Amino acid sequence: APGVTVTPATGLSNGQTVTVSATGLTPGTVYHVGQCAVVEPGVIGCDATTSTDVTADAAGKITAQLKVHSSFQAVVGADGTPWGTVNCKVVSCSAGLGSDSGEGAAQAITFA
Numbered sequence: 001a002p003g004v005t006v007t008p009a010t011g012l013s014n015g016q017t018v019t020v021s022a023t024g025l026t027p028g029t030v031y032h033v034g035q036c037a038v039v040e041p042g043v044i045g046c047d048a049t050t051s052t053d054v055t056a057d058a059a060g061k062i063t064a065q066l067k068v069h070s071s072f073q074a075v076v077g078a079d080g081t082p083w084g085t086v087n088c089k090v091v092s093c094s095a096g097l098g099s100d101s102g103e104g105a106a107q108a109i110t111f112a
């Protein structure tokens with residue numbers, strides 16, 4: 001049962017490192033960790049420059065560092081097509097993780 005905690009998650013600075021802690025994942029599955037936002041209804045765009053892949057361990061956990069930015073160039077789809085700029089002080093952004101099947105979780109973050 002996926003659950004995630006992002007610390008810290010509010011009053012963040014541009015270029016700040018946060019820790020993403022997840023539990024209840026499937027051991028051995030690769031999860032994509034990243035900062036994302038809804039760019040268009042039904043379309044999520046994320047920062048491909050700061051995203052990373054981590055395999056969940058035998059306990060179904062992942063603990064990863066992620067650098068977040070108050071504005072980023074979002075990529076959409078599986079081929080990573082550039083969409084454009086996302087400003088997280090105007091739209092809601094999140095940090096979280098998900099597998100290729102969409103299993104995962106995310107937490108909304110805010111910048112100072």
Ligand SMILES: [Ca+2]
Pocket residue numbers: 040
């Ligand atoms: Ca459009």
